[PDB]
């Protein structure tokens, strides 16, 4: 498992530079514990931590390994686009420019294919006057693609263009492929930091509690719900089926059910239950409701097939129950909602506009430090640095007997539950109010 | 050919025998000239002849009747009872109108009582009947901060004879049918069963088309939202898109029979470069031929399709349902065929397809819808309570109109391709029309003249 | 009025269309509407006739056009308060000069007829496809706005100078005065030059008119505006949410703001000047059974207040009122908003945007074809063009006998009402829903 | 000098005597489990797991498995005070359902319009909080059971809370109604009455200690950047044009930091962390108006407050009577390009309060799930005894903190940290040179539009 060794952010040799940026800086790195919950009770000595841990956090540095006047910076981002992909791009490109006065920004276009032979004369000029905007709108201004291009390739465009860092905007395979050009600049002896800013809309990396864009995709996750519950409790036994991204895990679905409150059933790749158990709890939900709103994660029920689109699949077979069923639900109504486009490719909240621009500037002050082969996070309310080989082994996924967990299992269908005596208590709790209003109506004449 | 035969007796609407009540609204007193009675708009307000020194004379003979408060009323308004039900898709204000019926109804007339019938005509069933709920200030309070209906809806007919059964039953007077031409179809229906028995009920439609392609009409309630909403969608679908090499998004915006929806929000987006709608059938080959030309010089492209297009298109699933028609999902599949086919041309493409129906259909109004919906059923009301009956209220040349049924069914409204909106449409959108090499050399010319121009003034501004 | 004749209504038109209109599928001859579509006589088997006898000329592409489109400069100001929509005017002008007619220049006069003075007209932008891209996202206007007039001579000077043949005045009536004495000066040298307005008024008190571009999106902002006034003004025993909503001389926003919110209890109109004491009472009323009020107030009302900021004034007014009868309301809370800033600088609704798109547009295709001396204006549910001499002799105003008013009167506080008999119905109601409500959950238990 | 003097002490939370009943909510805790004040090491990476730098320890907040309250003999009472904040109707709600749904308690109360709720007056006044009357209310700003500001004789209202048989109650406000809390704690205690004090803190300000986040502020943040937006488009749209936009901050200025850095259109921001003269604003101004012909200034209700004398006077809830610094700043930067009229011809000075936006809105969903879990974990600690205590979010955890020592202490920017540092990169900085710093633009700009230029004359042919 994890050791110390494991969490060694490597720095190119040398820090020759003073940092040109103003005191209105750190001459050491500092370090945050992973885990900052004591081993023993309260004692007289100060609290020891649960694990040996150390992460390196974020900061400006007095001294850096590169030349600001003399520095190329490249960017590329690739994969699904997330809400701040141009607020991540705006914010390297003026913190280089405004911040460290960096020779030249270039923004490599369709992700990794903008370093090959043929895309690299698609690249483009990062200037003020390109990002003065583009963080009011969603995508990539650079564009983007999926699936790997030849490091060989890359590190010659790299060198071509005098590029002395690549900031890599992306997924797990897009950092692994940040590792793999990493080390192809090693091995020529190239001046090179690989440094990664973390693309994950379903905020499932590790070393992390939040990656940009996650917030901004629950807000539009709990409009797409407030629509589908719109559209199922205006029918009689109607059913809203929504998919909430969630390709690996759930966080995306389970913040969206608690928040909006309106999600009766709630499916996540961490808890997988069969088509069976599925019918049971809409069954139960039509025993003394006429709608039914469904939360199903792109990841959850991959088994139901021979990723299958299990969105599509879900609301064939609800379709077939309750057709089989229609002696009991005589008329149904099953609606199938794929919001998918409209939360990733909005512009991010302003608390996302924030932290996209918190990120990247601190991983322009820490390239320029002479990082290399690691990325940004955002744990326990501090920014730190994780390698990348210890960050693309590991994943984050629900903890199903955690706080968020037990909230949606509050609010959705419960077969455990005495509906009908819970029903009792509600009706007692109500005639309780009425017979109030009722008193002091009939005081209030005279 | 077949022309429709609309005469003025055509445009009289029903009225209930006798007005023998005052209205406590409308004190005949608070006028300022002389007969409380019906007052007309023309039909057409453009002119047979050039101006001249008589007044001009209207290209159409048809006068419609003006919707209005009345001085005189039908119904006594301590003894009615209003009995309201939405049927058919669900459209952004259904609980806007909900409302306004109500609290006109019980604030402005004072009516004994309101009844929401559930689940469309299913509500007015011996079975459905039972679950009708009483529609008091209370229950209406904030209900049109939400989409969709607090009194659900359905589709499809009910026996005209157990609907007015529970009608008479319940000593309903009036009956608000909020619904499309289905709906107002069973109104007259319901209104002529009434009239057989010889019970005093109005029947008054309340049009429901999110399309906006009712007759006698300019415009219908939640239609301005879904063109917001729309555009919404086409703003993420262009995100997508653009963010892709050889990328397009299809993106359907309803348009069953009309392409008013598609059409506005392609102009008020203003980043549509194809426009699909069922007014204007063309093949297959056209699109992609559409799309061929966008790529010569663009790296993506934006269609907009109506679900009424390309009916002509194509000819059970795994769980045996019976699989509908979807232009949205065909025309997704043929566009991927066509690209895949010229993956020479278009080394790497991607294909995104975008239903925002859901979102476009069940949100609560814009205000501007808000304030119509309020108008058209506070209207509805005040004639209602006046004795119209077989007819519906409708909005015109920025007037309220009372159409009868009969006629307002007989008739549908479909874009003019040779108006002024389709001419925008043809503006923003892909034009085979036009020289592809030309056009461009025109376009950069336009471009290094600005960036001359800012190049010399920077210059200036140095050694200045 | 009971004046203004078809000789009013006729448009100027620049003498000769020598040239085809390149557009592609137009008009040979003007159309024209009535102004009242209503009948004199009743229904009979004869088409009915106007009670009026005027007609306006309606606007569209015309097959003839007065200026050599690739000779042909357009020049573009906007004046006074901004209001949503004036980038979605600027971009629409200048694509359809572009893109349509293929004119040789678009020119972009700053601040308002500074921008055409001899200091000003050194700023002076040109306006080509990349300039224009998406200003119509944002509020405001790019080529900036000022108040106040120019020497006449001097700005046709400017226009000369700068060959432009089109000048399109967006601005209200102030601005297209000013433009009608351009337009003169221009005709006095013989210079071959169009003036031609695009009315901006948030107000919608445009005559020859039902719809003004921005007043539609201020009405969204403006109820808006009221949902925080409310909840403030709800939170608080004897709570009172004073709001101005813009309105001149004309209350169409107050009003139709008043109507699509449902939440203000008086509403403040200059077509309805009433007395401090009347607006007392009125409050007086709502706080016999209501612990909140809402007070809609437009700018131009109680101008016979002062011996001026009336929404102040009031605010003011309404503490002294609560103060001096602190005996019956013992702690109250009085909450001043004025969201004016919020409502003239947004981007218009998509809506709003089509709209100033299509009068945009028009008003190309009518100046092309030598349209000058005039306003485009919308009326049942057409475009038309309007002389600005009648134009800006005539303004709009609330009817206070029609639909709008009598809604507003519906909803917002009555002296007329017995305050006592009213409550004892109101009791009534609520006790027979209640009633019923008590009675099937007794049913429901067993 | 003078340090805070902050002990474990002054961290531990109170709990009424026992815990005698099980947790009626199923599939936690059998005992206290805690989290560092300070997650940083004293020394470096070594073969020992590494030592906090601080000595203190908070609680950690949790469903116990034992509760001090019988759930079915128990009645919980709510009320909220002071200004509204996003997020209140979600507060209720969720202490509402909580006590309902998972503990099925007796009874759940409303106290309306604040203290005075509890008062012998206001009491009548008390409203049932059932399901159905909460359903909905967390789509509306406000607070359905009303605010008011300042206190209420505490006898009165403990003789109200006997009289109800009220056994929790929760305090949502700010440190004046806490301070209140603890006064009806002790009153309770005095006459040896079974009754836990629990505070939700409500703060748009986001400056409570022992916590990086309290619920609204998000939401704050999100209007406050729509109010630039707004401000901006009006004053690029005049020649010398500035826009004033007040953007709440009694004591701390985060709302208007993040508000600036969110919305990068600011070009001057005025927090009461770092006091500065009219001269040095008016200079910041004169520089901004160098290059450019607009200026944005965000300015906190709490800069500035020796540019005036106030009345000496307190408002109902015991704090100072600001000067209006909105209204006085925008007077005086009109007085100035007055003066200046010469270099400045024509200006225009636009004031923005949107103080009635920022606070009266429904939340964000991420303050709406912030909201629920804390009014969640308040019902879980309150049942298992907890009272004088506040509950915070910390770290990413949800801890509890006693009112004494929550309000001894305040939290403001730090003007050497990170966020502060955004702020002072896209705001006016007297520092550069005006005249070099202009001609290294035009450079950049340049060599941009000369490759522009080259790619267009390529693309011909
Ligand atoms: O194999 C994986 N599949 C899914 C997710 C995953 C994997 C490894 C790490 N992670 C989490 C992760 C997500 C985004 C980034 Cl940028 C990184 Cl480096 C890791
Ligand atoms: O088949 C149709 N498809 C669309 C529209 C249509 C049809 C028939 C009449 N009409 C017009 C219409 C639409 C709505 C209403 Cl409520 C009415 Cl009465 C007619
Ligand atoms: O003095 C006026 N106050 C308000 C309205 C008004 C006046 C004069 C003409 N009009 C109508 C009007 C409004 C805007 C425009 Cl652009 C025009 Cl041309 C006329
Ligand atoms: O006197 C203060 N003025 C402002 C802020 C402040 C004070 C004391 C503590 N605090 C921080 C604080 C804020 C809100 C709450 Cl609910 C609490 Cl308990 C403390």
Redesign the interface.
Known sequence: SVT?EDLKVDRLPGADYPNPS?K?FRDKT????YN????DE?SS????????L?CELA??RSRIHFNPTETTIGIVTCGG?CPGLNDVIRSITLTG???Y?VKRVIGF??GY?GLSKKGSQTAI?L????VT?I??????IL???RGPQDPKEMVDTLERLGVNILFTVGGDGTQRGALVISQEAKRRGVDISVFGVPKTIDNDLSFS?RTFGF?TA??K????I??????A????YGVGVVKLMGRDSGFIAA??A????QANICLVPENPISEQEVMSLLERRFCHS?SCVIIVAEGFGQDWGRLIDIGV?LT??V??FL?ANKSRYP?STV?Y???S??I???PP???D??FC??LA??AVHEAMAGATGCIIAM???N?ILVPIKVATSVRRVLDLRG?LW??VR?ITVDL?SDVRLA?????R??????????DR??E??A
């Open positions: 110390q103003k209105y500092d370090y945050i514990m900052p919950r004591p081993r309260p000595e100060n609290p020891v931590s649960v694990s040996p150390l900061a400006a686009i420019i405004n911040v006065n276009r369709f294919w000029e200037h003020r006057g390109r905007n963080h009011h709108y969603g995508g990539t564009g983007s693609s509690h917030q629950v807000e996750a709990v409009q797409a407030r629509a589908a519950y719109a559209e409790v205006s029918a009689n913040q969206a608690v928040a909006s409150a006429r699949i064939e077979k379709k077939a057709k008329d609606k909602i794929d919001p486009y409209m990733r490719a909005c909240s302003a608390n506009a924030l621009a918190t500037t601190l744990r326990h309310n920014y706080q037990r909230q509050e455990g029903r009792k208590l509600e009706i709790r109500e005639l309780e109010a009425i017979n109030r209003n009722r109506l009939h209030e004449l």
